[PDB]
Amino acid sequence: MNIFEMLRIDEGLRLKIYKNTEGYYTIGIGHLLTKSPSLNAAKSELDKAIGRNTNGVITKDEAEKLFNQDVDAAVRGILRNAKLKPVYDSLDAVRRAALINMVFQMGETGVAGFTNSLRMLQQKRWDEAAVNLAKSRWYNQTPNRAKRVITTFRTGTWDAYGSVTVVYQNGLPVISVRLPARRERCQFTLKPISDSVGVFLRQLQEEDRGIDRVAIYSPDGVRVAASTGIDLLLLDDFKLVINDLTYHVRPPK
């Protein structure tokens, strides 16, 4: 787990233009296009960012490239900023990623407005920061995200985020999932030919009382049919949604 997997979870993946929860036009993995309320302003901005005529639509490659630029921008924004850099340099990798997340969501300047929180973080005072961050326009606008980001600063662990990975062992695919607020990782061995998506999903549910929703989607956000055999599933990437969160899974081969 790292900054890129973390932001994938927080931000999801969309190949069409959409309104985020603040209601601004966005695409890709959390790429804000404009704060303008015009959809043409937004299509216009997209075309500039990609360097072609998209008609509001991009490819998975274009999303990852853009995402990669935005993260880079966010790190370079921290290093150029005089309030942010000291804090960033004091922090371990996991807490650094929490900060970059914040910068990525609300810019260099919004984040430097958090003078007390930042001081507390520099001073190693993890709960006092957490409590303080928890009282902010940020937390109010996007509380679920903010809680996750705050838990990362509080703890210095990846506990608020989850996981999904796919590995072969004996020629069988093995899927491991660590859920948010869970110490234990859990794994699932499937039979490629005879097992299907729905079988795997029912097992996922069976494993934890805390799961109220599970689904698989293509990267395009189209639901994969439950009856689809696991061998077909693993020919490409897919999105596994578990409660609120989405995990972009990238099987080998």
Numbering used by the authors: 1 to 163, 1075 to 1164
Task: Kindly provide excerpts from the paper associated with this entry.
The mitochondrial calcium uniporter (MCU) is responsible for mitochondrial calcium uptake and homeostasis. MCU consists of two conserved transmembrane helices (TMs) connected by a 9‐aa linker with a four‐residue “DIME” motif flanked by an N‐terminal domain (NTD) and C‐terminal domain located within the mitochondrial matrix 11, 12, 13. MCU is associated with many regulatory proteins such as mitochondrial calcium uptake‐1 and mitochondrial calcium uptake‐2 (MICU1 and MICU2), an MCU paralog (MCUb), and essential MCU regulator (EMRE), forming the mitochondrial calcium uniporter complex (uniplex) 3, 4, 5, 6, 7. MCU NTD appears to be essential for the regulation of mitochondrial Ca2+ uptake through interaction with regulator(s) and/or modulation of post‐translational modifications.
To elucidate the structural basis for the impaired activity of MCUS92A we determined the 3D structure of MCU NTDS92A with N‐terminus T4 lysozyme fusion at 2.75 Å resolution. Overall structures of the NTDWT and NTDS92A are similar with a RMSD of 0.60 Å. Interestingly, we found that the NTDS92A induced a conformational change in the L2‐L4 loops. In the structure of NTDWT, hydrogen bonding between S92 and D119 maintains trans‐conformation of the P91, which is located next to S92. On the contrary, NTDS92A breaks the S92‐D119 hydrogen bonding and induces conformational change to cis‐form of P91. Overall, L2 loop conformation in the NTDS92A moves away from L2 loop of NTDWT at a distance of Cα atom of 5.6 Å. Sequentially, side chain of R93 forming hydrogen bond with E118 in the NTDWT moves up to the position of S92 and makes a new hydrogen bonding with D119 in the NTDS92A. In addition, L90 interacting with hydrophobic residues, V88, L115, I122, V125 and I153, in NTDS92A moves away from L90 of NTDWT at a distance of 2.5 Å. Thus, we suggest that a conformational change in L2‐L4 loops of the NTDS92A impairs the mitochondrial Ca2+ uptake activity. In addition, the NTDS92A induced a conformational change in L2‐L4 loops and impaired mitochondrial Ca2+ uptake activity, suggesting the possibility that S92 phosphorylation induces structural change and charge distribution in L2–L4 loops resulting in the modulation of the MCU function.
